[PDB]
Structures are given as structure tokens and as C-alpha cells.
Design a protein around this ligand. Structure first.
Ligand SMILES: [Mg+2]
Ligand SMILES: [Mg+2]
Ligand SMILES: [Mg+2]
Ligand SMILES: [Zn+2]
Ligand SMILES: [Zn+2]
Ligand SMILES: [Zn+2]
Lengths: 299, 41, 111, 130, 56, 286, 97, 111, 243
RNA sequence: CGCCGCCAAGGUAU
RNA sequence: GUGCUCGCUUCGGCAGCACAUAUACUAAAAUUGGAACGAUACAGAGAAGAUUAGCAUGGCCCCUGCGCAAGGAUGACACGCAAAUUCGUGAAGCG
RNA sequence: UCUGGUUUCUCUUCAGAUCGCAUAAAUCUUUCGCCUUUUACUAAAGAUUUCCGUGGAGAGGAACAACUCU
């Protein structure tokens, strides 16, 4: 079955799958976070309320107990997936929070980035920023490596930057995009980082102790960005074999991480697609878009 | 949806209808409060 | 512009409300126009307090015409604030201020 | 929830006893209305775009399931190659030169933003009507 | 973010309106009667700020 | 007495823009029929168009399936009098003020608080439609309803604004052709127009044209459907169906019943979802 | 209790609303599908999201509309069946008593 | 609505008493087709009160016992209210509470 | 709360404080006289039955009419309200009872019996099955959906009051002085006692207009039309067996 | 040892 | 439109950045229905004799008044319906 | 060597401090004194509000914010 979900009154910007594959989370312009049953009749239960801005990004921690929510109101909320109660508000940035990521494995960490040009490292126990990295241009997407040593940031300078938590220095720069980077995501191994950019190029970059030093490992094509200027996000399949990235042309693009062939182009959406997620065990794709509906593609 | 004259349809801020005694005195424990009513013979 | 436009809306056209805030009939009123045109405390007491502030602002603009000095205005609006009832008729539709008139009339001796 | 439950169509001849208007879904006697939380800036931007040049994108969710086209006046979209009202255009054509006097010293000669421009048988019928 | 203006605005408005014997401003005169309720809220704040005789 | 959330708003008053901004009030203006305090809403349809705020309330629009501000029907885009003349049931409503007007208006508002989805009496008889009123059902209507009303001082030549006067100019109106039931002056001429259409000129003889050339059969029209649609008119003498031209030939004994078929099938007989082709037969043994 | 509490709160903010209440924060849009006429009406009108704000009511206004109407009371709730005991009639003499 | 002031005391107690005896005889009379000729038991109650005021014993023949003894206890309740108000306002005009001509000229006949 | 409520035919409902013995609220708004009143056991609302056609809800701390219950055609004699649904029971002088909805204001169910009008309803308060009161064939009802449980015997006097005890005994007070006991298990008339007059009253003046038990329910006390409260206790005997 | 300071509806009908 | 930046090669040409869609649209109206009051002429004034204090009930009548005071001619409008007693007709049923 | 902020303008609830080094009116329930009925009243207590202002607290800016407390 395909499964069509509806509920969100405004554009949906993000959706994720619980780490154990039992439930979904979705949120967008409305300001509401909806939880869904992956199986059963695809029922909707709790609605998380309390964000005054729009929800830019949801994430689960590796345990599936904590749900993080970056909002345009400058606050990143921490949510309890079990009860639906709010835990903390990370008040800090002077402008919109564009994105957030939560470190897996190592003691709890959270990274945020915003239009004020800064990137901040948060310890959920401190109620204060730990480190601040002033760039100079607006920051759009941020992710941690699996060793919890490095922060990877994509902005509007077409250059992905890597930060060293101990030195607090610009360790690496990556060249290879012709335009703004809208979405970054690490492989489950830590081995590779997937990027979307306005230039319509999906580029995989490999981050390793020993690097070729020219890490344009692969390039894929087909993903279109347009005048809507929506943030575009991409995801790795549970086993790293598939690459999905949403586009503004109503099609879900799924590529073969090796041969680079388009495996899937799927329609069904009326508007631009904002995020595509893969179920952690089974070949199920959750597609979220600006038409306020979700689909559960099965492969 | 179209109530009486008291709700919205009048600006008659009438006398004797004012927020007087806007707090309710509750019967405390030294009087015949219902917590001591639920167990006495 | 509001106390005359109340009369202009209520279709009277015989009460000559003047700038120094008083009220006068003109036409030796019959029964169908006497009972239509008489006001209670809300119109009249507002008329007397507006007459009081009218006399105050007339005193200030008389000062700023340039023919009277500051001590004379001081004794003037002292007499205005101390001898209401003698010249404003504000006690007529609200008697509680009468004691306050006495509260003025006593303290003036202290002065 | 399951997509197959809402995707399953209704077995029937569409019931053409009703008309096209009354058999259509609604909740108010005029259309299905529901509130939402669309951004203000791009909304007003494409509103001003359609107000000036007459083309904009088409907002819905479940009309055709694939929609990325432009509406209104069609040819003026590809004539201007899809520009906005907040963007500096590729050319400056048909521009209209005014005169300025912003010294604020002269009398009856100061004409800044309040300036007038450089450019500055029916009565018989209107008499016969009245 | 609203602030002061020239003080010759109120004078021009009321010299245009005047004693309200014209047909042009008839949409506003009822609003003047709507200013009847809050007049002692203006007269009280007037008489609270009277100029002292050491002022001008 | 009345609160609302969103009005009826047929498409010819929304404007040419899907993106309009609208301001609202809680208790706005009175209706021009019954003086009920509705909620007037104000918006800008177009750049050369007036605001067209609100004419009537929600309840009086829910009686007769009427739009909000120009007093036309939502289901077609026609006035009320044409609609209940075409359906021949008026659903009466009084004329005075306190005699029987607000009484039955308040009661019909009271019994309609549950649905709010369909009118009170037109729900059963808006189904048997699209026969006599589909002939004049204007798609993509003229936007001259949305243009502002005429201003003065251009009639007398006094307009100091010139071009920046927002209403209109150089429009001389005519004092010869301009409420709820009756009477409407151009609507009588519109009924005369639909009564004076353009059929074929009737040849002057005594009803000898009993044959008729109807075609456009294809795969929708069959012989038994056509002879049962003729069976309600009367009995046959000799009928046939030819498939090299996709046509049918029917006659009648004493012409008159087929005559109203000539009234029924002048590009008007719509069965099986097709505008059929009809021209005259021979009736001359040619 | 919360039903009658929100009812009486709307009543107090309606009967006595005079003391310093904010209007609303009208940042919401409304999206209503033109599912009545549109095939070529305003070509491309498919769900037509519009903007809804509220006009500010100035606090210098008397009540505009004459609340003085009086109508007779209409038809009430329809009568239930009456279902008494079987009605008896006594005699010709106790009715005379 | 309007409250009951000192003038509508006797014009409200009689209305409540006639309403009470109205819905009492409406619920006490048996299943006959006629109730009270629409005002007659009220007339017997009023005439029993007028006969008690002159102390006429009011022995009317041919009358059922429950309506006549409910009229007797109702005029006895009105008599109790009448004498308990008579004692009260006699004490008030004795000590000097009210100076009303209506109360004094009424209490003359009510003693 | 440490205060009481009173009401009468002066078109006034007074809130008598008990810490100062004075009136603090002075409810008003009824277009006619007032017959009865009742309180909710849990929340701070009050219900009042009046003479014109209506029962009304008075909100404590606001003294504003939240709902007016307008469905009758005559006066309403008594009113009771409780915490469990349905809330409001109004028996009126147009020979009907009706059970209301306190939230929406519209009625839930109307109850048509009793050729002579209903004047007394009461809650038990332990379990369901409330009772009604009328001069002709006094009846018994139910809280959910309405249900005629049982009718009682020939208590054919015109009645005013009903009071019921938790252990199963019930008392009915009428207008002819005859007050009657009942049981809750069967519907059996036990005593059939009549009260004599204290010396000032005449032969037929006695009519029970109030009756209530103690909170221990060991003592009953009635207020009659002879301006007298009579107080009954138990009888510690054994030879009063049922035939 | 030094009270007290007064308006109107009640009448020339609707 | 305006300011800044040689930013791109003439102070001038160009490019970028910032500012980002008000208005019951009117001075009018062919104008719209025109209720109160005043003027004209009628009718005229509660309680089974006359002059009359009044307080009330109703709702499709209002006015003055801040009114849960009060007063407006008791503020005005409040009328013939007999019901069961006699007889005739018709219906339902019983011996 | 690092630490790095007084005013002004907008919401945000708590107030128990002569909230204000002073002090207005109204309502109810009672006692009075003028009084014919009432509103205008007299002046004492009991208990509520209304109203002119005030106290400390969460944010967003701007005003020399870079003088410099630390
Ligand atoms: Mg009167
Ligand atoms: Mg009268
Ligand atoms: Mg009187
Ligand atoms: Zn209407
Ligand atoms: Zn319309
Ligand atoms: Zn013009």
C-alpha cells in the first residue's frame, strides 16, 4: 500500500522516523509536531505544542527518547518522545535557527546554526552555549561526525566548513559547490557526508583521518531547486546503499550510492518536496512536502 | 450566536451589576467543612 | 462641539447652549417639548465641570493675552478653586461635592 | 494510519442525481475552508508579482499530485523569465525621468517627493442626460 | 515606533471641523458624541498638569 | 446578533487574483433588507477595481443559495428570479418589517444551526436542474462588476485629480435601463432574450416535416435509448438507425409531439453527455 | 466547569469589556477550495489561500444599531406525546357537587 | 426587570396571592370540564376578605368545603400579614420613624 | 462555603453571609417572583426556579445569568441539581417535568405525566432512580435516558414536598395536613400519620410546606401551614409489623 | 467649645 | 525615485546593497427612504351619581431619566363570547 | 593578560510594604438627622469594588555604547 497522510494545515518541512522504526514525527509551518504509528492504521497521536516560530528541523537522538526541534523563533526545543512534555528551550541565537543536530554515542551534545552567522555547541545540562563559531555569512545546515570531534557546517558561501572542538579552528574547507548548501547528512558509519545545494548538485564528501585531499567522492544529478528557496534536505538509507533527496519539481529522487543511477523518481505530490526519510529496518520512504500530505513509499 | 441583551447587544453598564465580592471565601478546617463531614457520625 | 451636538441630534433646536457652559430655553415651552427636553445628572454635571475648566482655561488665555500678571491670576484661580457653588451651580445636581466646597471654604482661612 | 484506507475510492456511478456544485465537497455551503500557517513574505511577494505582471505559482496539495506550473497571464512569465518585484531586473527599460529640487531653501520652488510631473462634445450629452 | 509630529496638525483639523455645521464631516460628528464618555478622563489629566505661576 | 467566519463569495466578486488580503470586523453594517448586524469583510480584488465590501448577511444567503455581495446565485451565477421561474417554486418570504419578516427569519436561522451546509428548501429541487438554465450559464464572466462606480466632477468638468481619480472616467450612464424578488428591469429583457433566441425559420406548411436528421451517435447513443426517449413523446410509424453516418431517423403520426422534440433538440437535447447534431430532414420524397 | 467558565469569561469580556483588552494577533491565513464553479473561472484557482486580519475598533463609538426590536415568541420545541393515565368521568351528581 | 419598592407592596402581594390560589385551584379541582368560570373563586376570595374586614361571618350556602376553607386560610394569612404590618408601622409612627401621610391615614383605618 | 442563600416573592435572591449576618450579593434579574432554588454540590453555580416561565443559572463570584432555561409555559415549582449527568431537574405547573443540559442550555428530555401538576422532586443521594411528586399517582423515574420505574399507591391529596433518606424511608408532605411515609424497597405506606393543630389554628389550616431530615437522618422535622415546625424521632419498639 | 447654605419629576392634558 | 560602494575602464555608462504595495478610496453623487417636532383640522380625559389620590397585570406602543429610584392623564391600549341549564341534528356502542 | 553596561520605549505576571509619609467616589447591609414619595441627602460602623498613580520582573530594540564598573 502507498498510504496517504494528512493533517498539517501548513507546509511540512521535515519528518523523521523513530530509531526503532515504530513511529514517525512530522512538523512544519503550522508549528505542530505530529506523531504517527508506522504500522497499524497509521494513526496520529500526540501533538507537541509550544513553538511560536515554524519548525525547521526535527531529529531523534539515537535512543529515540529525545526529539529536538529547531524553530524560526530562535529557540531549540527538547521534547520527550515518551510523554510529549517539553524538557528545555535552548535560548541563544539572535536570529532564526536554521538547523540542529544531536551527537550520537558521546555525552549529549547539540549543535545549532542561524542567520546570525554563528554555530553553537550546546550541552543539554548547562542552559548556556559552550562554544560559538562566528562565520560571517548565514549558516544553513550542520552535522557532527560520529567521533563527536568535528562539526560540519554548510552556509551560503558554497563552502562546507569543518570545525575542531579542541582547537576551535577552521580545520577544513570543502570547495565544489557553485551555490548555497541547504542540507548536510552523515553516513551511519561516519564515512561520508551528503550535501544538497542550489546549484542542483548532490555531492558526497568523504571525511577520514587519511583523505585524498580532494574529496569530491561522487556527484549525482536530477534534483531541482527553484524560486521557492526552500531548504532542501537529503538522507542516507539505513545501510548506506541509497541516497534520497527531495526536490522542488514534485519528484522524490532516490539514487544508487555506487553506480549513481536514479533508482526512483516518484510523483504523487502536488508541490515541492522538503524532506525524504528512510525507515531504519524496512524499505519504506516517508516523503514530506509543501502540499501538506505525506506518503509511505514501499520498495 | 445572538444571545440576549446582557451579553453583547447593550452598553447599559447598569448600577448594582459590578464586580463586587470577586473572591469566594472557602469554609476552612475549623468549621464544618466537607472533609470533616465525610467521616463524622 | 459634543454638548451642542447632543441637542442637535435630539431634534430640540430651542436650548441655546452657550460657550460659557450654561443652558437656556427660548420659546416658553409647552408640555410636549418640556418633558422631552430635561437632562439628569450625567449631562448637567459634565456641563458644570466643563464650565469650571472653561473658566480655568479662560483665566490662562487671559494671562497669555498680555494684560494681567501672575499674582493676579494666582488670586483669581485661587478664588475659582475656593468659591465654586457661588459661581458654577455644580452642587445642584451632585450634593456630595458641597462638603468639598466646605473643605475648600475652610482651608482658605488657613491660607 | 494507512494510505490505502484514504486512497481506496468509492464504488459507485458518482451519483449524477445531484449537480456538479452540490455533489462537490464542502463544509460551509461554499468550499472546504481550513486555516493554515503559510509564511507571510513569499505570500505577499507572489501577490505583488501577480498584481504587477500577472503570473504566480499555483498553491494546493491534492489537485493533480504533480503541479509546478504558473497561472494567470502565461506568456509574460517566460517573457520576463520568472523575475520578482523585489529583484533588480536584467534591464532598465521605459524608465521615467522626473525633476528634483531638494535644496529646501527657495520659496514656492521646493518640489521633492510632492512634485507634479513634467507632463503637467461630451458636455452636450451630459447636459442632455441631466 | 510611533512618535511626535508637528503641533499644527490638531489646529488645522479643528479649524477645518469647527462648530460642525457642514455636511462634509457628518461621518465624524457621531464620533464626537463617542468622545462624550471619556471626557472626564481628559479633564482630570488636564487639571492635573496646570502651569504653576513660576512657569510661563 | 450575528457572528461569522467566512462568507459565500462567488468567483466573479473574488477578483482575478488568488492572493487577496482581507480585513474583518465583529459587528459591521446592517443588511439592506432586514437590518441584521452581520460581519462586513473588506478586500481588494484588483488593481483597477473597487473594494466591494459586503451587501447582505450570512443567513439570508443561506436561504436561497445566494452569494454575499452582488446578490447572485452560487450554483450558476444567475439572479434569484430566473432560478425560481425556471424551477417554478418560489419559497416565499415576506415584505414588511415586523409583520412576519424577522419572525420566520429568526426561526429559519434557528432550525438551520445544525447543518450550515445546504439551503433549507432548495436541497431537494436543485438536483433536477441543468436543463433550462444551463443554456445561459456564463463561464469566465465580465469583470465590469468589479470596476468602481462612477464619480462626479467629470460629468461637470471640475475634477482636479484628473487621472489619479480612482473610480472611473468618460463613462456616460443611461437613465433608461439600470430587489429581492421583484421587479428587475434588465432581467425582463434577458427573459425576452432567452425567449427570442435563434432557431431555424419555420417553413410555411401544415406540419409535414415529421422526419428529422439527428446524428452524432458514436458509441453513446443506441436505438433503444432513442426510441424510449421518443416513447415518452408518443408512438412511432417507421424508425431506423444508420451507422455509416452515425444517424437516426424518426417520424410521428400527427406531428406535434415530435414538434416539441424540435423544441427539445435544437443543439439542446443532451443525453449521454454529448451535444448532438440536428438538422432538417427532407419531407419531400427527394 | 471549564465549559461554564469559558462561557462566563466570554460573558464578562462581553458584558463588561471596557477595561484594556487586546484585540487579537491576526497572523493566520485561511485556505478555501473554489469547489463551486472553477474550470476556467480565474484560470489556475485551485485552493486560493487568502489573508484574514481584523479591523481595529476605536474606543470612541456609541452602539451603532438600534437594539429595540420586539417580536412575539416563536414556535417552541415540538410537543412530546402526553401519555397520561386513562381519563375518567365521575357521575352526573359529583360534577354537580 | 424592576424591584418591589415601598409603593408596590400592596400591589404585588395581592398579585402573588391570586396567582398562588390560581395554580392551587388549577391543581386541586377534579376532572370536570369547567374549572372556575375564569374568575369566580377569586371573587369569593375577595368577598371573603371584604366580609372579614367588616367581620361579616360569610356563610354562603351550597359551596364545597376545600375551596372555601382554602379561601379561609388564605384570608387568614392575609390577615396575619395585615396585622403584623399594622403593629410594625404603628410602632414606627409612634417612635417617629416615618412622617408619611399615606402610612398614617392608612394606619388609622388599619386600627 | 460559610454562607447561605435565600429567595422569595420580592423578586430578590439574597446571599446571606454568616460571618457578618448581612447581604453581600443581592441577585436580581428575574422578571417575576421566585419559588425555589438549589446549589451544585461541587462547583460554584446555583439554579433557581421562578414564576413566569423560566429557571435560571446564577454564577457565584459573577452574579450574572449564564443560562436561562426557557422551555415551560407556566411556573416551575421546585428544582434540583447534582454533579452526575443529567444535571438539572425542573418540575413545573404546566403538568410536566424536564431534565436539562447545564452546558448548552437546551433541554435534554421532557417528561409528560401527572394530570395534576408536579411540585416536588428530590435526589436520594445514594444510587440512581430519582422520584417525582404530584397529587395524582405519585411516580418514580431514572437518571439515564428516562425510565418509569414504579408508581405508588393512592396518595390522592395535593402535595408540596418530598424528602428521602439513604436507608430507604421516604416522607411526603401534603396540603391537607396528612403526611405519609413510604419505603424504597417496595412502595409500602407504613404509618399514615396526621398532625393535630396547636391551639390558635382552626380545624383545617394544617398543610405541610417543608420537610427535612437531619444529617444523621435520625430526626425528621416539618414546617407546616400552621406556622409551626414539628419534630419527629424514632420509636424503639418492635410490634409494627407489615401485613 | 459656635449646627445649619437645595435641585428636579409632582399641573396647564395626548 | 533616493543614498552608499570605482565594485566593473570614461565624475557621467553599468553593477550590487539598503528602503518594499496605503485609502469606510469623493471635494461628489442621477441621489436614496425619509420616521420626530412644529403648523392645519379632528377626537376629546379610568373606576356602575359628581370631583378625583393612586399602585398594579400583558406585549408587536413608546418618552424623560445614570437607574434593579421615579414620573410621564392610574403614561396610553384594554369592548360584546352567556360553559351545559332546556331542545333539535349527527356519530360510536349496548338490550 | 582574560572578565565587559546606565537610560528611554513596548508585554509579563506577582503584589501584602504608611503598595501612595495623601486619599476620592459608588454599591450593599444596618443605625441616625432633615423628610411627603423618590432621586439629589446628612454622618458613623461593618465589607467590598471601581478609579488616579506606584513597587519587582521575563524579552525585543534604540539612545556615545564603547566610557569603562567588574
Ligand atoms: Mg407610573
Ligand atoms: Mg398605567
Ligand atoms: Mg406616585
Ligand atoms: Zn439579512
Ligand atoms: Zn457576489
Ligand atoms: Zn475623476
Amino acid at each position: 500500500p502507498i498510504m496517504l497522510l494528512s493533517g498539517h494545515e501548513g507546509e511540512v518541512y521535515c519528518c523523521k522516523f523513530h530509531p526503532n522504526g515504530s513511529t514517525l514525527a512530522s512538523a512544519g509551518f503550522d508549528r505542530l509536531i505530529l506523531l504517527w504509528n508506522v504500522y497499524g492504521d497509521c494513526d496520529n497521536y500526540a501533538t507537541l505544542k509550544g513553538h511560536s516560530g515554524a519548525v525547521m528541523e526535527l531529529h531523534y537522538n539515537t535512543d529515540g527518547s529525545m526529539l529536538f526541534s529547531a524553530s524560526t523563533d530562535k529557540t531549540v526545543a527538547v521534547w520527550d518522545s515518551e510523554t510529549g512534555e517539553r524538557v528545555k528551550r535552548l535560548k541563544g541565537h539572535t536570529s532564526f535557527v536554521n538547523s540542529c543536530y544531536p551527537a550520537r554515542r558521546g555525552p549529549q551534545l547539540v549543535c545549532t546554526g542561524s542567520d546570525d552567522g554563528t554555530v553553537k555547541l550546546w550541552d543539554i545540562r548547562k542552559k548556556a552555549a559552550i562554544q560559538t563559531f562566528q562565520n560571517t555569512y548565514q549558516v544553513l545546515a550542520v552535522t557532527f561526525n560520529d567521533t563527536s570531534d568535528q562539526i560540519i557546517s554548510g552556509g551560503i558561501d558554497n563552502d562546507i566548513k569543518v570545525w575542531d572542538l579542541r582547537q576551535n579552528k577552521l580545520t577544513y574547507t570543502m570547495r565544489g559547490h557553485a551555490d548555497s548548501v541547504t542540507g548536510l547528512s552523515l553516513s551511519s558509519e561516519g564515512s561520508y557526508l551528503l550535501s544538497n545545494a542550489m546549484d542542483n548538485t548532490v555531492r558526497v564528501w568523504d571525511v577520514r583521518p587519511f583523505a585524498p585531499k580532494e574529496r569530491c567522492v561522487k556527484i549525482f544529478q536530477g534534483n531541482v531547486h527553484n524560486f521557492e528557496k526552500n531548504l532542501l534536505r537529503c538522507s542516507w538509507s539505513p545501510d548506506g546503499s541509497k541516497i534520497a533527496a527531495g526536490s522542488a519539481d514534485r519528484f522524490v529522487y532516490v539514487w544508487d550510492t555506487t553506480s549513481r543511477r536514479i533508482l526512483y523518481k516518484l510523483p504523487g505530490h502536488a508541490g515541492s518536496i522538503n524532506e525524504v526519510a528512510f525507515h531504519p529496518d524496512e524499505p519504506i520512504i516517508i516523503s514530506a512536502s509543501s502540499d501538506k500530505r505525506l506518503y509511505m513509499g514501499e520498495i | 450566536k445572538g444571545e440576549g441583551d446582557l451579553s453583547q447587544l447593550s452598553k447599559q453598564y447598569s448600577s448594582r451589576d459590578l464586580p463586587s465580592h470577586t473572591k469566594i471565601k472557602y469554609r476552612q478546617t475549623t468549621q464544618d467543612a466537607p472533609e470533616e463531614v465525610r467521616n463524622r457520625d | 462641539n459634543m454638548l451642542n451636538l447632543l441637542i442637535h441630534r435630539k431634534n430640540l433646536n430651542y436650548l441655546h447652549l452657550d460657550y460659557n457652559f450654561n443652558l437656556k430655553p427660548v420659546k416658553t415651552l409647552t408640555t410636549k417639548e418640556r418633558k422631552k427636553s430635561r437632562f439628569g445628572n450625567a449631562f448637567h454635571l459634565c456641563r458644570e465641570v466643563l464650565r469650571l475648566t472653561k473658566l480655568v482655561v479662560d483665566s490662562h488665555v487671559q494671562y497669555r493675552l498680555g494684560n494681567v500678571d501672575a499674582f493676579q491670576l494666582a488670586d483669581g484661580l485661587q478664588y475659582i478653586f475656593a468659591h465654586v457653588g457661588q459661581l458654577t451651580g455644580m452642587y445642584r445636581y451632585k450634593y456630595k461635592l458641597m462638603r468639598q466646597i466646605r473643605m475648600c471654604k475652610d482651608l482658605k482661612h488657613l491660607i | 494510519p494507512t494510505y490505502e484506507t484514504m486512497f481506496a475510492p468509492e464504488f459507485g456511478p458518482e451519483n449524477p442525481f445531484r449537480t456538479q456544485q452540490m455533489a462537490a465537497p464542502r463544509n460551509m455551503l461554499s468550499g472546504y475552508a481550513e486555516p493554515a500557517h503559510i509564511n507571510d513574505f513569499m505570500f505577499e511577494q507572489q501577490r505583488r508579482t501577480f498584481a504587477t505582471y500577472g503570473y504566480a505559482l499555483d498553491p494546493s496539495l491534492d489537485n493533480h499530485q504533480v503541479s509546478a506550473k504558473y497561472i494567470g497571464s502565461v506568456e509574460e512569465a517566460e517573457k520576463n523569465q520568472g523575475l520578482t518585484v523585489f529583484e533588480t531586473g536584467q534591464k532598465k527599460t521605459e524608465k521615467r525621468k522626473k525633476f528634483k529640487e531638494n535644496d529646501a531653501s527657495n520659496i514656492d520652488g521646493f518640489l521633492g517627493p510632492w512634485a507634479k510631473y513634467v507632463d503637467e462634445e461630451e458636455q452636450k450629452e451630459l447636459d442632455e442626460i441631466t | 515606533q510611533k512618535e511626535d509630529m508637528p503641533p499644527e496638525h490638531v489646529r488645522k483639523i479643528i479649524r477645518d471641523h469647527g462648530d460642525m455645521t457642514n455636511r462634509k464631516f457628518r461621518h465624524d460628528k457621531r464620533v464626537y458624541l463617542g468622545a462624550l464618555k471619556y471626557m472626564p478622563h481628559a479633564v482630570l489629566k488636564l487639571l492635573e498638569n496646570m502651569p504653576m505661576p513660576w512657569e510661563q | 446578533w450575528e457572528d461569522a467566519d467566512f462568507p459565500i463569495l462567488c468567483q466573479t466578486c473574488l477578483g482575478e487574483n488568488p492572493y487577496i488580503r482581507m480585513t474583518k470586523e465583529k459587528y459591521g453594517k446592517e443588511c439592506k433588507i432586514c437590518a441584521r448586524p452581520f460581519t462586513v469583510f473588506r478586500w481588494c480584488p484588483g488593481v483597477r477595481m473597487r473594494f466591494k465590501k459586503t451587501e447582505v448577511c450570512q443567513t439570508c444567503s443561506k436561504l436561497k443559495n445566494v452569494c454575499q455581495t452582488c446578490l447572485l446565485d452560487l450554483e450558476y451565477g444567475l439572479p434569484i428570479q430566473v432560478r425560481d421561474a425556471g424551477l417554478s417554486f418560489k419559497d416565499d418570504m415576506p415584505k414588511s418589517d415586523v409583520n412576519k419578516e424577522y419572525y420566520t427569519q429568526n426561526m429559519e436561522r434557528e432550525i438551520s444551526n445544525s447543518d450550515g451546509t445546504r439551503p433549507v428548501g432548495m436541497l431537494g429541487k436543485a438536483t433536477s436542474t441543468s436543463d433550462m438554465l444551463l443554456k445561459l450559464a456564463r463561464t469566465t464572466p465580465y469583470y465590469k462588476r468589479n470596476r468602481p462606480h462612477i464619480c462626479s466632477f467629470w460629468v461637470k468638468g471640475e475634477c482636479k485629480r484628473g487621472e489619479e481619480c480612482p473610480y472611473r472616467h468618460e463613462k456616460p450612464t443611461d437613465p433608461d435601463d439600470p430587489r429581492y424578488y421583484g421587479i428587475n428591469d434588465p432581467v425582463a429583457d434577458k427573459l425576452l432574450k432567452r425567449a427570442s433566441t435563434m432557431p431555424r425559420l419555420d417553413p410555411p406548411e401544415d406540419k409535414t416535416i415529421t422526419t428529422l436528421y439527428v446524428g452524432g451517435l458514436g458509441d453513446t447513443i443506441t436505438e433503444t435509448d432513442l426510441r424510449n426517449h421518443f416513447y415518452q413523446f408518443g408512438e412511432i410509424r417507421t424508425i431506423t438507425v444508420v451507422q455509416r453516418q452515425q444517424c437516426a431517423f424518426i417520424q410521428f403520426a400527427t406531428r406535434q409531439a415530435a414538434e416539441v422534440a424540435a423544441e427539445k433538440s435544437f443543439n439542446k437535447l443532451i443525453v449521454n453527455g454529448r451535444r448532438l447534431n440536428v438538422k432538417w430532414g427532407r419531407s419531400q420524397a427527394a | 466547569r471549564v465549559a461554564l467558565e469559558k462561557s462566563v469569561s466570554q460573558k464578562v469580556a462581553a458584558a463588561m469589556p471596557v477595561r484594556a483588552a487586546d484585540k487579537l494577533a491576526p497572523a493566520q491565513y485561511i485556505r478555501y477550495t473554489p469547489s463551486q464553479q472553477g474550470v476556467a473561472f480565474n484560470s489556475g484557482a485551485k485552493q486560493r489561500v487568502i489573508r484574514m486580519v481584523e479591523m481595529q475598533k476605536d474606543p470612541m463609538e456609541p452602539p451603532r444599531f438600534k437594539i429595540n426590536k420586539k417580536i412575539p415568541r416563536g414556535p417552541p420545541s415540538p410537543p412530546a406525546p402526553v401519555m397520561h393515565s386513562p381519563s375518567r368521568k365521575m357521575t352526573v351528581k359529583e360534577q354537580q357537587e | 426587570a424592576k424591584t418591589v419598592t415601598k409603593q408596590r407592596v400592596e400591589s404585588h402581594f395581592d398579585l402573588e396571592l391570586r396567582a398562588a390560589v390560581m395554580h392551587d385551584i388549577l391543581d386541586m379541582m377534579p376532572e370536570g370540564i369547567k374549572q372556575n368560570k375564569a374568575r369566580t373563586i377569586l371573587q369569593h376570595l375577595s368577598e371573603a376578605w371584604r366580609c372579614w374586614k367588616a367581620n361579616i361571618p360569610w356563610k354562603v350556602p351550597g359551596l364545597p368545603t376545600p375551596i372555601e376553607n382554602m379561601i379561609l386560610r388564605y384570608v387568614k394569612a392575609k390577615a396575619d400579614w395585615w396585622t403584623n404590618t399594622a403593629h410594625y408601622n404603628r410602632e414606627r409612627i409612634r417612635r417617629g420613624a416615618t412622617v408619611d401621610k399615606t402610612v398614617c391615614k392608612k394606619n388609622l383605618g388599619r386600627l | 462555603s460559610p454562607y447561605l442563600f435565600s429567595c422569595g416573592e420580592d423578586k430578590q435572591v439574597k446571599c446571606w453571609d454568616l460571618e457578618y449576618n448581612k447581604v453581600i450579593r443581592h441577585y436580581h434579574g428575574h422578571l417575576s417572583a421566585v419559588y425555589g432554588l438549589d446549589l451544585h454540590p461541587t462547583i460554584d453555580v446555583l439554579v433557581t426556579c421562578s414564576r413566569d416561565s423560566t429557571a435560571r443559572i446564577w454564577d457565584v463570584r459573577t452574579k450574572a445569568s449564564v443560562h436561562t432555561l426557557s422551555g415551560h409555559t407556566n411556573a416551575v415549582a421546585t428544582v434540583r441539581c447534582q454533579a452526575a449527568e443529567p444535571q438539572i431537574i425542573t418540575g413545573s405547573h404546566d403538568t410536566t417535568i424536564r431534565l436539562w443540559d447545564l452546558v448548552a442550555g437546551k433541554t435534554r428530555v421532557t417528561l409528560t405525566n401527572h394530570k395534576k401538576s408536579v411540585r416536588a422532586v428530590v435526589l436520594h443521594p445514594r444510587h440512581y432512580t430519582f422520584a417525582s411528586g404530584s397529587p395524582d399517582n405519585i411516580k418514580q423515574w431514572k437518571f439515564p435516558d428516562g425510565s418509569f420505574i414504579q408508581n405508588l399507591s393512592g396518595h390522592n391529596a395535593i402535595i408540596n414536598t418530598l424528602t428521602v433518606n439513604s436507608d430507604g424511608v421516604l416522607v411526603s408532605g401534603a396540603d391537607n395536613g396528612t403526611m405519609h411515609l413510604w419505603d424504597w424497597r417496595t412502595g409500602y405506606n407504613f404509618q399514615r400519620v396526621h398532625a393535630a393543630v396547636q391551639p390558635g389554628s382552626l380545624d383545617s389550616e394544617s398543610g405541610i410546606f417543608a420537610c427535612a431530615f437531619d444529617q444523621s437522618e435520625s430526626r425528621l422535622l416539618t414546617a407546616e401551614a400552621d406556622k409551626t415546625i414539628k419534630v419527629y424521632r424514632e420509636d424503639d419498639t418492635a410490634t409494627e409489623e407489615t401485613h
